[PDB]
Every structure is written in structure tokens, then in C-alpha cells.
Design a protein around this ligand. Structure first.
Ligand SMILES: *[C@@H]1O[C@H](CO)[C@@H](O[C@@H]2O[C@H](CO)[C@@H](O[C@H]3O[C@H](CO)[C@@H](O)[C@H](O[C@@H]4O[C@H](CO)[C@@H](O)[C@H](O)[C@@H]4O)[C@@H]3O)[C@H](O)[C@H]2NC(C)=O)[C@H](O)[C@H]1NC(C)=O
Ligand SMILES: CC(=O)N[C@@H]1[C@@H](O)[C@H](O)[C@@H](CO)O[C@H]1O
Ligand SMILES: OC[C@H]1O[C@H](O)[C@@H](O)[C@@H](O)[C@@H]1O
Ligand SMILES: OC[C@H]1O[C@H](O)[C@@H](O)[C@@H](O)[C@@H]1O
Ligand SMILES: OC[C@H]1O[C@H](O)[C@@H](O)[C@@H](O)[C@@H]1O
Ligand SMILES: [Ca+2]
Ligand SMILES: [Ca+2]
Ligand SMILES: [Ca+2]
Ligand SMILES: [Ca+2]
Lengths: 220, 208, 45, 207, 589
């Protein structure tokens, strides 16, 4: 006889992400050689970790301006990859096609003032649960860091990943409007003759940043 | 980590700088060969469809993520739901050779016919947006607005008509799907997420 | 290797399945691994 | 401890405010001996020198994103541009060097970037110009940015009359903030140079 | 109401030349002339068919209209065998504006080849003439070019002079038809002129810059008007933007010192709000009032049916900065009331400025109608005191009587401003003169007015019987401004018991008749003339009607034929002034 099989039910439908490869139809094709061709990347995080990209502030600008008044809050933006400030970043470009992430997010802070303007800043991480701090006195009790503008003009602060669950959603919830993943606040503490001068900021993937579960954003 | 702010070498101020430690990080779901070999829908014409990968839309996943690369190499396999007989033709044959059946037809087997095509381009690596001599471009001048503007948008379209995997021709294709495997990418380009008008782009996430 | 999930060998050989690549005679993984870390000056505890 | 004076051929370029050279996309050149040319290529060593050009005048009224896009190769009226009208297929790298000389009392910064195949950009796309071979210039730290890139392209040799692979892009990230003691207007120059050109295929003479 | 209609001045031109598409007065330094725009008139310019010309029409003596040479040349060349311009069908004379010695005419459809590629773009051009001088003024003919620049600007589509001798120019096609307001001082227009430079830069130029793409196709500069609105003396810029706000139409007002932005808006879709604008102080408060036209406006009647009648919005300028907007509707359907709006100055010399509004496609046989509206304290009197009718039939394009008009000019020195009406559809232009206004203080007194039937005072010659008599007395006094006779003869009529086929119970003594006429001749500005006479009651047994009051009626008529002057311009009596008055008398019991 012939080898009996059972044409099983429920199996064999076309799934769009399956590891089944299609049967060939036209063989014996030799490609032109491509070896040692410049500029190859393997994973999308290595582009996101080796190349930092700007943020967005009020006025469609990447820089934040020093403030010559009693209020000392330069910027105060919620921490999500669907935020308003993170929107033009490459890091939130590919995090629009996933569901959840983990790991650190590096923030790069380059000061573009003249050689006579000096200032010092701080950036703090306010974990969720109460209102974010509005003064650098109140934000001294976070996981913060300070730096002043001198010869090396760039500062990189790695945002810690604190969460209950092991992975956090990269899409902020549509109905839930409290943003219970966290805030990140950056202040100025003082400035000497630094009026009208800028602080261009950047963002990169961290050392241990890794995404998970790809879906289709579909320009939403 | 204080750095030299303009040298543009990579710096990663890790979380150990203020106490703590880093964990093991896995990056399989962001691999460029894993994220690109899944099926994507493109809109078909009635009969003749050149199998260009840059006719994938810009809102979908592997169309907006293929445009991350400047130069790409990937073998294509298609999956097309049609009626009649569907003849694939290699790169650069005359378009009168779509009717001939010596070219690799697939007879109609219900419901759809998926088949693996080789890289048939003459170039060593294809490209997402070739610009031989179409754009200057450091600041294009105001030319066409109003009615004429819609057609003026195709002025800057890609020209290497050799940037295709060939063409398929059936009686009426209904839905033909691309996926690209063994994908190699080169020279990254910017990738854009959509612009929030609120404090944060809050969309309705799935929930019980 | 890709998005394959089969432990069996392929049925069609190698050259009726893909297009064979030809040698003649990567970057951003080397770029992201040469990243500076630590500090720039004399740190304290 | 610093060697900060580059030269290409018989032309030198000494800068004292170099933060460093950035090798974009490769540290070494591709195999120039292709099979699409049958071994009829040859290196022209006399094309490797600098040539100066003017880009724009970065003034205090320029907002974010006043970009400038010049396609390389541009009109070279010397030895290199003679090869464009005398040989059909040629390939080369580039090592650009832009200068924005003000003084150490101006503010602001302008990003410099070598980007391949650049056309039809948006100002919302300018946020992520950092992905390319880039190097910032601010007057508080440096005056120059020195970027070096190899030949990229769809295929090994190129027809430069119908195709321009690279595009030197300078855009202004923070606006120029003059002070009581700074410089009012700075002018952005650049000296560009090819690296190891290889022509193949002699045109007939125009006579 | 005082405009002469009997024998108004008629002027004509070549048929098809659109003679009357634009009109103005020309008063130099001491003869008076008329400017008529004929944008389709053939010229002797080398190889230019229908270049269009402006004609200076001699008002003195004969009716001769001599053309004016602003430009006698043909198309200049950019290079060899490469024309720079296209003056053929350039519609020169489509808009003509004059101020003293300065005449400004424009060619909205003048096309121009770029200084780069070989294009044909309607930037429009103008020619400014100051007596012996004559320069060219093409502000839209610049380095900024086609569609998104000033290439399709059609500069000169509407023009106006300010009091500080500054030109206001409108171009509805700039920046993808956003439109543009351009203002230059007449000094630099000639001072910076250069026959070899096609794109002249003017140092003191005010202009509306390009705006967002959502402002495209709005047609700013479609029409223009000048007047002060911020109270600094300098004329500001009023312009209609008829396609703005999704075809609802708007009107912009910019500062005449720095082009700084009031803004009016329409109430109906596609009513063409802003097709025409006018600025004149209508209520004597020395605050310039805004008039906006919308000829396509549809109104509802008692039958509740929509009908296109046209509408003009009268916005009174208050010192508060606000406006007191009044809407005035058209009268005939599809007549496009409000197509042209022309300030007349004080037409009747009463103390308030007046204005004229036209329905060019109205009247019998689509001849055309012009309505005259008088100003007063409260604002503009919504009822027209005069209705000017076209007198010419159609050929192909309708007569369009009233499509363009100009007033506020005392061209005959009679103390009263006149009006030009252009009917380009029949290639005619008409000058209406204003007749002198005579105010008249008529009087009538009856004493005693309570008649005792048994009084019997005044004797009656012929009979021994005496009758109950009383006195009737009438007075005339007249005066007027401007040029008019110092002698004025009137015809006074008196009737006793005007209320009565019935029997009249009172008659005049020295005539025995209820009717009496008196040729009276009073003097202008002179004292009040007054003639009285005796009337008497009939006998008690001659009538039963003793309860009905005896009404004494006085009526007067002026001799217009003898009041005429030189040309035969006969004066007129003031409106709202009773041509007759009446007092009464009762009988007791
Ligand atoms: C009876 O019949 C006789 C004759 O018809 C009437 O005679 C009249 O007497 C009037 C009053 O005297 C007189 O008025 C005018 O002359 C007045 C002087 O004689 C003079 O004072 C008046 O001026 C004033 O008059 C006006 C009149 O409207 C009043 O309104 C003022 O208040 C002033 O009083 C007049 O100029 C009139 O002229 C005269 N007429 C005649 C024809 O003789 C008489 O009044 C009759 N009387 C009765 C019985 O009624
Ligand atoms: C008092 C007298 O004779 N009246 C007459 C009047 O009837 C006539 O109408 C007029 C004509 O001008 O001349 C006068
Ligand atoms: O995109 C919104 C943003 O656009 C631009 C300006 O109009 C800003 O005021 C505005 O906040
Ligand atoms: O500077 C303000 C200006 O910037 C740009 C746009 O966002 C405008 O809407 C805004 O008016
Ligand atoms: O949005 C920027 C834009 O804002 C508004 C104006 O001030 C323009 O001059 C400027 O270019
Ligand atoms: Ca003013
Ligand atoms: Ca007023
Ligand atoms: Ca009046
Ligand atoms: Ca008059």
C-alpha cells in the first residue's frame, strides 16, 4: 500500500508570520557580490543606541532656553515613548511598532552658550504615585543628578527603569490619563549671564534597552 | 557622564553611574532579519503589478521600517489571491512577455498561491529612494500649488526602473502580499512616529 | 537565521530556494560597542 | 598629545580646534577591483586635494532648521572636474571639512552631516539627522567639523552626470546668539576633498 | 436729486474698445478734463493688437476725446529674438486714477517674460504721469515669480491715491491668489525709475507679505479704498478680499503707515462680499465710513423665496474704534446692486457727504441703473433721492451703465460736485452735472383764523352791504450756495376753501374769486418778500356747511427756464421741502 496520513483539521491555514517558507519556482540565480559593503546595521537597537536624536519642545525646537525669573523649571515631560516631547526621536520612531519595552533611556544634554555664560542644571526622575515636583528643592529627593557647564559641554544621564512589572507598555493608554509609568523633570538651579542661551537635548537607547512583541502602528 | 560634546562618538552613561547595575538584555525582536520577513498587504492593480518593494505603504510596519534603510538586499516571496493564471516575469524582460506561459505561471489552486522569487536585480544592492538627478536638494523652489499640485508630487519619484523584482500578471489579482527574507540593510534613515497634539498621544489600548 | 522555525532540513537544495550570494576578493554593532562609559574626572564614593 | 593637521595630496589643512575626525560608515575602502569593469580601472592620484566652497551666512535671524544641501560632486573647475567630463565611470570617497569661524563668545550650534541620496526632506525629519555621519559645531568649543565617508552606492562605479550619491548638509540647531562681545555674522566655508578616485572608461574627445 | 438728466454730457469711443470700463476726473493747474479707460482700444504701438488706451476728454466746448500716450512703444526684447513682454490685450486703462497733475493708469493683463526661463506671467503694469514726466510702475514684476510669487499678481487690478501722495495698488493673484496690497510713495516711483531695469526696488515700500497656504485664492487687492481709521491723519488701506473665508468674502483694513492689520466679513456664501469698497465720511463726524459691496447677495421676500438682489454694508466709524454697520439691499433681481460705489462729496451741499450705488445690469432692457443716496446725521438715508437710468441698448456684452463711476469733483465750478458714469458695454461715458439747490422759506398767515360770521367789517364796493372779512398773507425767501442767479421769480398760487364741485365759503375781496395768482420775484439771499390781501366770508344764508374748516392753500413754482445759466443748467428746489403749505380757518357758533 501507500503510506497513510491523516489530513488534520485546523492546521495548514495561511498565517502571515509563520516560519514556513514558500516553495521555489525559478532556481540557479547568482547575485552580484556585496561583501564588505559600507554602513550595514544588523539590529534596529544598535542604530538607536549609537545615534542619538533630538527631542521636541514648545515652538518645534530641540533646545530649551534658560529662564531669567523666579521659576526654575526648564522642562517637565512625562516618561513614555508615546509622549509629546519624545515624538520626533528615532527611539520613539521604532517604539511605535512594538507594544512593550524595558531598560534605560539615555538623555544627552549639550550646552550651546558662549564662553562667558555659565549655568548649572539638574534632572530628576519622579516615579509615579503623586504629583511631579515643581521646585529643585522638592526634586532633590528623587534619583537626581546635577552638572555645570565647563570645558566638556555634554552630559549623559541614564534614566532608571523602575517598574512593578518586568515590561512596560510603550503605548500610553487611551482612556487612562494619569501616566502611571513616571515623570522626568529637568530644572535649572542657577545661571550666570546665560540669558537667551540654549541647552539642546538628545535621546538614545540605553545599554540594556530592548523592545518586544512587534505590532503594526499603521500611522496611528 | 561628562563628555566631549561635539566629537559625536558614542557615549552611554549607564545606570551604574549613580548606583545600581544593568541586566541582561535580549534583542531578537528588533533584529533586521526577524522584523522584516512577515507578510504585508499592498494595493494591487487589475492585471500587471511590478514587484517593487517601495510600493508598500508608509503607514504599515515593514513599509515604514524598510524605508529606515538606504540600501537593502532581500529575497522576495509573494502570496497572491487571484483568479486565472499568474505569470511571474524576471527583471528587465519586455512587458509583452507577461502573456507567455513558459515564464513561471502558477495555476489557480484555491484560495491563494505563494511562491518564492530570487533577487533578480542587476545591482549589488537595491535602494529605497534613488536620486540620480531629480532633487537638488537643499531647498526646493515654490513651483506648483492648487490643482496642479497633486500631479507635481510624482515629479520626484524613483527612476531606476531596474529597482524591481519583476512583474506578475493575472486575469484579476485581488490581494497580493509581500514579505522579504534574508534581509540585509545598510545606511540607516530617519524613522518617524506620528505627532501628538495632546500632552501624550493616548490611544485606546486593548483591554477586557 | 531569520524567521524560520523548522528543525528539519529544507526540501529544495539551496539554490532552488534562495539566490546564491557571491563573495569578492557589522558596522553599527562595532559602533555601539565602542561607547564610552564611566566618568571623565576623578570620582568619589 | 594631539596630531590635528590633515593633508590630502599636496594641500594641507591645519586646525587648532579639532574635536576629532569622524569616520562614517567604514574605516577602510571597498574592493575597487570589480567584475563590472573587466579590470580597466585606474587610480588617479592627482585628484586628491582640497577645494574650497561657500555655503551660507549663518546670521542671528536664522531659526531652527535653516538647512543647506549641496550635492557632491559639485562644479570642480580643476583637476577633479576634468575627470567628470573625460571618464564615464568613477568612484571616490570624501573627507569634508566645514569651518564656522566666529569667536568663543558667540553661542548656538549648527549640525553638520554627510548624508547619502538626500532629497525631499521635511523639517519634522530634521530631528533625526543625528543618524548619519555627523559632527556638531558650536563656537564655545570648536570651529571645524571633519567628516570622512567612503563610496556608498547602488553599484560599484557611478555616472556622476546622472547621479549624486552624497549630500553635505549643515543645519542650525540653536540660533546664533551674538552678545556684546561676540561676532555679529559668521560665514560658513568648506574645503572638500576626494579620496582615492578610480576612473574607468575614456570618453572620446569633444573635437 | 439735483443731478441734471435732461442734457448730460455724452462721450463715446471705438466699438469693442470697452470705452467706459474706468472713469475719473483730471484737474491739473486751470482747465478741466475727463479720463475714460478703454482697455480694449487699438493703439498705434508696433505690433500690439488691442493694447488699450486712456483718453483725456475735453469738457470745455466740444466733445473731443484725445488719447493719452503713456507708452507708444511695442514689446521690448530680453535678448535677440526673445520678447520680454506681451502688451497685446494687456487691458491697459482697466483702472484709471488721477490726483492733481498725477495720472495713474494700469494694465492688469500685461504679461511678462521672466529674466530666467521663457514664461508669460501676468504681473500687470502701470504708467505714472506727472505733467511732462511719465514713468513705469510694475511692483509685481520682480525676482519673485510664478504662482507662489508675484508672477500672476496682475498688479494694478485696483489702484488709489492717498493724501500724502502715496500710491495704493492691489494684485489678486500674488502667492497663489492670496492677493497682495502694495503701497509706494509717488516720490520713489519716479525717483527710482530706470528704463533698463525691469524689477525696480523701492526703499519705502509697504506690502502684505505671503501667508499660509490656507489663505490661497482669496483675491486680496480685488478692490481698494483709502481713508483714516486709527486717527493719525494718514490714509489707511481698505481692500476687498471676496474669496476669503471659504467664499464668504472679507474686507481687510491695514495701517497706511506700516501695513499693520480691522477685518470685515460676509454673511452669505459666494455673494462676492468685497467686489467693491469705498471710504467716505457719510455722517459729517469727520470719521471715514466703510462701504462694502456684494452684488450677488440673495434676499428673501414675503413669499420666502431667495432672490439675488445685491447688498452694500454701510459701516459707520465710531470714535470707539467700533463700527455701526447698516445693510442696504438691492431693488431689482439679477441687477447686481453694489457693483460700483462712488463717494460724491456733498452732492446737494447740505452739510453731509453723499454716495452713489449702481446696479449695472438693471433697468429696462438691462440698460443699467445708478442710485443716489444722501447722507445725514444718523448715517446714510436708505431711500434713494434720484434714479439714474441708462439710455442705450445692448449689442453683445450688456451696456453695463454704472459698472464704473467717479464723483466728488466740481468740474463746472457751480459749487456743486458732478458725476461720471461709464457704460463700457456700449462704449459710452456720461457726465451728469449737479444743479444748484435752492432752499425756500415760504410762509402763510391767516388772521384772524377764527372767523365771526356776524363781524361784517370790510365793506364791499358796488353794494351797501358789508361782509365778514379777514387777511391772507404769504411770504417767500430763498437762498443757495454755489453759482446761481441773484434774482429769482416765482409763481405763487392761492386757493380759498381748498377742501371743497362743492361751494367755497370764502373768496378774495378785490376780485370776488376764490383763486388768486401772483407773479412774485424775490432775490437770492435778499430779504423776505411778502404780499398780503383781503379775503371775505360768504353770507350766512349762502351755504349750510359751517363745521368744515376753510383751508387756505398756497403753492409756488419756480421759473426754471429763466433761472438757467450759461450752459442752461437750471437750479432745483431742496428735497424734503414742501412745495406748498396750507393753513385753515374756522367759523364759530
Ligand atoms: C372782525 O373783522 C375785522 C375785519 O376783518 C377783524 O380785524 C382784524 O383785527 C385784528 C386784531 O386787531 C387784526 O390783526 C392784525 O392787526 C392788529 C392791529 O389792528 C395787530 O395787533 C395784529 O398783530 C397781532 O395780530 C396777530 C394776528 O394773528 C395776533 O396773532 C397777535 O397776537 C397780535 O395780536 C395783526 O397784525 C387784523 O389785521 C384785522 N383784520 C381786518 C381785516 O380788519 C377783527 O379781528 C374781527 N373781529 C372778530 C369779531 O373776530
Ligand atoms: C397774476 C397772473 O397774471 N398770473 C400769471 C399766471 O396765471 C401764469 O401761469 C404765469 C405764467 O408764467 O404768469 C402769471
Ligand atoms: O503644530 C502646532 C504649533 O504649530 C506652529 C505654531 O502655530 C505654534 O503656535 C503651534 O503651537
Ligand atoms: O513664531 C510663531 C510661529 O511659528 C511658526 C508657526 O507655528 C506659527 O503658527 C507661529 O505663529
Ligand atoms: O512661524 C514662524 C513665523 O512666525 C510668524 C512670523 O513672525 C514669520 O515672520 C515667521 O517666519
Ligand atoms: Ca491711519
Ligand atoms: Ca463717519
Ligand atoms: Ca449731501
Ligand atoms: Ca456742477
Amino acid at each position: 500500500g501507500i503510506f497513510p496520513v491523516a489530513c488534520s483539521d485546523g492546521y495548514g491555514g495561511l498565517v502571515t508570520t509563520d516560519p514556513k517558507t514558500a516553495d521555489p519556482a525559478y532556481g540557479k540565480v547568482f547575485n552580484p557580490p556585496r561583501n564588505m559593503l559600507p554602513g550595514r546595521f544588523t539590529n534596529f537597537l544598535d542604530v538607536a543606541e549609537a545615534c542619538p536624536t533630538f527631542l521636541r519642545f514648545e515652538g518645534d525646537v530641540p533646545y530649551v532656553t534658560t529662564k531669567t525669573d523666579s521659576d526654575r523649571v526648564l522642562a517637565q515631560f512625562d516618561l513614555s515613548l508615546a509622549a509629546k516631547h519624545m515624538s520626533n526621536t528615532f527611539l520613539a520612531g521604532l517604539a511605535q511598532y512594538y507594544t512593550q519595552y524595558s531598560g534605560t533611556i539615555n538623555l544627552h544634554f549639550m550646552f550651546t552658550g558662549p564662553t562667558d555664560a555659565k549655568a548649572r542644571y539638574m534632572i530628576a526622575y519622579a516615579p509615579p504615585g503623586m504629583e511631579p515636583p515643581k521646585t529643585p528643592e522638592a526634586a532633590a529627593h528623587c534619583i537626581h543628578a546635577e552638572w555645570d557647564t565647563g570645558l566638556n559641554s555634554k552630559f549623559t544621564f541614564s534614566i532608571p527603569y523602575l517598574s512593578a512589572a518586568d515590561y512596560t507598555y510603550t503605548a500610553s493608554d487611551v482612556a487612562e490619563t494619569t501616566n502611571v509609568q513616571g515623570w522626568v523633570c529637568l530644572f535649572q538651579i542657577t545661571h550666570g549671564k546665560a540669558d537667551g542661551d540654549a541647552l539642546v537635548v538628545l535621546a538614545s537607547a540605553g545599554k540594556d534597552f530592548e523592545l518586544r512583541l512587534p505590532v503594526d502602528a499603521r500611522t496611528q | 557622564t561628562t563628555s566631549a560634546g561635539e566629537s559625536a562618538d558614542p557615549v552611554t552613561a549607564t545606570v551604574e553611574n549613580y548606583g545600581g547595575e544593568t541586566q541582561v538584555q535580549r534583542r531578537q525582536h528588533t533584529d533586521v532579519s526577524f522584523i522584516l520577513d512577515r507578510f504585508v498587504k499592498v494595493t494591487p492593480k487589475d492585471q500587471i503589478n511590478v514587484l517593487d518593494l517601495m510600493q508598500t505603504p508608509a503607514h504599515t510596519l515593514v513599509g515604514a521600517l524598510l524605508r529606515t534603510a538606504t540600501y537593502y538586499f532581500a529575497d522576495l516571496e509573494v502570496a497572491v489571491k487571484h483568479e486565472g493564471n499568474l505569470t511571474w516575469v524576471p527583471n528587465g524582460a519586455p512587458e509583452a512577455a507577461l502573456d507567455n506561459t513558459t515564464n513561471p505561471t502558477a495555476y489557480h489552486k484555491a484560495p491563494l498561491t505563494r511562491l518564492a522569487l530570487p533577487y533578480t536585480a542587476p545591482h549589488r544592492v537595491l535602494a529605497t529612494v534613488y536620486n540620480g538627478n531629480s532633487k537638488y536638494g537643499d531647498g526646493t523652489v515654490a513651483n506648483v500649488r492648487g490643482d496642479l499640485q497633486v500631479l507635481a508630487q510624482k515629479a520626484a519619484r524613483a527612476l531606476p526602473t531596474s529597482f524591481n523584482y519583476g512583474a506578475i500578471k493575472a486575469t484579476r489579482v485581488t490581494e497580493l502580499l509581500y514579505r522579504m527574507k534574508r534581509a540585509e540593510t545598510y545606511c540607516p534613515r530617519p524613522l518617524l512616529a506620528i505627532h501628538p497634539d495632546q500632552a501624550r498621544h493616548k490611544q485606546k489600548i486593548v483591554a477586557p | 537565521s531569520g524567521n524560520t522555525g523548522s528543525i528539519i532540513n529544507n526540501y529544495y537544495m539551496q539554490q532552488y530556494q534562495n539566490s546564491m550570494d557571491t563573495q569578492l576578493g557589522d558596522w553599527f554593532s562595532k559602533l555601539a560597542s565602542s561607547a564610552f562609559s564611566g566618568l571623565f574626572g576623578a570620582l568619589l564614593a | 598629545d594631539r596630531i590635528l593637521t590633515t593633508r590630502n595630496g599636496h594641500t594641507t589643512s591645519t586646525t587648532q580646534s579639532s574635536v576629532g575626525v569622524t569616520y562614517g560608515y567604514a574605516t577602510a575602502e571597498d574592493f575597487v577591483s570589480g567584475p563590472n569593469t573587466s579590470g580597466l580601472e585606474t587610480r588617479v592620484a592627482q585628484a586628491e586635494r582640497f577645494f574650497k566652497t561657500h555655503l551660507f551666512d549663518w546670521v542671528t535671524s536664522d531659526p531652527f532648521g535653516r538647512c543647506h544641501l549641496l550635492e557632491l560632486p559639485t562644479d570642480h573647475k580643476g583637476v577633479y572636474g576634468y575627470l567628470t567630463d573625460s571618464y564615464a565611470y568613477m568612484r571616490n570617497g570624501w573627507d569634508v571639512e566645514v569651518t564656522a569661524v566666529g569667536n568663543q563668545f558667540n553661542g548656538g550650534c549648527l549640525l553638520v552631516a554627510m548624508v547619502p541620496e538626500l532629497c525631499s526632506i521635511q523639517k519634522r525629519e530634521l530631528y533625526q539627522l543625528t543618524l548619519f555621519p555627523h559632527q556638531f559645531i558650536n563656537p564655545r568649543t570648536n570651529m571645524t567639523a571633519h567628516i570622512t565617508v567612503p563610496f556608498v552606492g547602488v553599484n560599484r562605479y557611478d555616472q556622476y552626470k546622472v547621479h549624486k550619491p552624497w549630500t553635505l548638509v549643515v543645519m542650525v540647531v540653536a540660533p546664533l546668539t551674538v552678545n556684546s562681545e561676540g561676532a555679529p555674522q559668521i560665514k560658513v566655508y568648506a574645503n572638500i576633498a576626494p579620496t582615492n578616485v578610480h576612473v574607468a572608461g575614456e570618453f572620446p574627445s569633444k573635437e | 436729486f439735483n443731478l441734471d438728466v435732461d442734457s448730460p454730457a455724452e462721450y463715446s469711443g471705438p466699438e469693442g474698445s470697452y470705452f467706459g470700463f474706468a472713469v475719473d476726473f483730471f484737474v491739473p493747474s486751470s482747465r478741466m478734463f475727463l479720463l475714460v479707460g478703454a482697455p480694449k482700444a487699438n493703439t498705434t504701438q508696433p505690433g500690439i493688437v488691442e493694447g488699450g488706451q486712456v483718453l483725456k476728454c475735453d469738457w470745455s466746448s466740444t466733445r473731443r476725446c484725445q488719447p493719452i500716450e503713456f507708452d507708444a512703444t511695442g514689446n521690448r526684447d530680453y535678448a535677440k529674438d526673445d520678447p520680454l513682454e506681451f502688451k497685446s490685450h494687456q487691458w491697459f486703462g482697466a483702472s484709471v486714477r488721477s490726483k492733481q497733475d498725477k495720472i495713474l493708469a494700469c494694465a492688469p493683463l500685461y504679461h511678462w517674460r521672466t529674466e530666467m526661463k521663457q514664461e508669460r506671467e501676468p504681473v500687470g503694469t502701470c504708467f505714472l504721469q506727472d505733467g511732462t514726466k511719465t514713468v513705469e510702475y510694475a511692483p509685481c514684476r520682480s525676482q519673485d515669480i510664478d504662482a507662489d510669487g508675484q508672477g500672476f499678481c496682475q498688479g494694478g487690478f485696483s489702484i488709489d491715491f492717498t493724501k500724502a501722495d502715496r500710491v495704493l495698488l492691489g494684485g489678486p493673484g500674488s502667492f497663489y491668489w492670496q492677493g497682495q496690497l502694495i503701497s509706494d510713495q509717488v516720490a520713489e516711483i519716479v525717483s527710482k525709475y530706470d528704463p533698463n531695469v525691469y524689477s525696480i526696488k523701492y526703499n519705502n515700500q509697504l506690502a502684505t507679505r505671503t501667508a499660509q497656504a490656507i489663505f490661497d485664492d482669496s483675491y486680496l487687492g480685488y478692490s481698494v479704498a483709502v481713508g483714516d481709521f486709527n486717527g493719525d491723519g494718514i490714509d489707511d488701506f481698505v481692500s476687498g478680499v471676496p474669496r476669503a473665508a471659504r467664499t464668504l468674502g472679507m474686507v481687510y483694513i491695514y495701517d497706511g503707515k506700516n501695513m499693520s492689520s480691522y477685518n470685515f466679513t460676509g454673511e452669505q456664501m459666494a455673494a462676492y462680499f468685497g467686489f467693491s469698497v469705498a471710504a467716505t465720511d457719510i455722517n459729517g463726524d469727520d470719521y471715514a465710513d466703510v462701504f462694502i459691496g456684494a452684488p450677488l447677495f440673495m434676499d428673501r421676500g414675503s413669499d420666502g423665496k431667495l432672490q439675488e438682489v445685491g447688498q452694500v454694508s454701510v459701516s459707520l466709524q465710531r470714535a470707539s474704534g467700533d463700527f455701526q454697520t447698516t445693510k442696504l439691499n438691492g431693488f431689482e433681481v439679477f441687477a447686481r446692486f453694489g457693483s460700483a460705489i462712488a463717494p460724491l462729496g456733498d452732492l446737494d451741499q447740505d452739510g453731509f457727504n453723499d454716495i452713489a450705488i449702481a446696479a449695472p445690469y438693471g433697468g429696462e432692457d438691462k440698460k443699467g441703473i445708478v442710485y443716489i443716496f444722501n447722507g445725514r446725521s444718523t448715517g446714510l438715508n436708505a431711500v434713494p433721492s434720484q434714479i439714474l437710468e441708462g439710455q442705450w441698448a445692448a449689442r453683445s456684452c450688456p451696456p453695463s451703465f454704472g459698472y464704473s463711476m467717479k464723483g466728488a469733483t466740481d468740474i463746472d465750478k457751480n459749487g456743486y460736485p458732478d458725476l461720471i458714469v461709464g457704460a463700457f458695454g456700449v462704449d459710452r461715458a456720461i457726465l451728469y452735472r449737479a444743479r444748484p439747490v435752492i432752499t425756500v422759506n415760504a410762509g402763510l398767515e391767516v388772521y384772524p383764523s377764527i372767523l365771526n360770521q356776524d363781524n361784517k367789517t370790510c365793506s364791499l364796493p358796488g353794494t351797501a352791504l358789508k361782509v365778514s372779512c379777514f387777511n391772507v398773507r404769504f411770504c417767500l425767501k430763498a437762498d443757495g450756495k454755489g453759482v446761481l442767479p441773484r434774482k429769482l421769480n416765482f409763481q405763487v398760487e392761492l386757493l380759498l376753501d381748498k377742501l371743497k364741485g362743492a361751494i367755497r365759503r370764502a373768496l378774495f375781496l378785490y376780485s370776488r374769486s376764490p383763486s388768486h395768482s401772483k407773479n412774485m420775484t424775490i432775490s437770492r439771499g435778499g430779504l423776505m418778500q411778502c404780499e398780503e390781501l383781503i379775503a371775505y366770508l360768504r353770507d350766512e344764508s349762502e351755504f349750510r356747511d359751517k363745521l368744515t374748516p376753510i383751508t387756505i392753500f398756497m403753492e409756488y413754482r419756480l421759473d426754471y427756464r429763466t433761472a438757467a445759466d450759461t450752459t442752461g443748467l437750471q437750479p432745483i428746489l431742496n428735497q424734503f421741502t414742501p412745495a406748498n403749505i396750507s393753513r385753515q380757518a374756522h367759523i364759530l357758533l
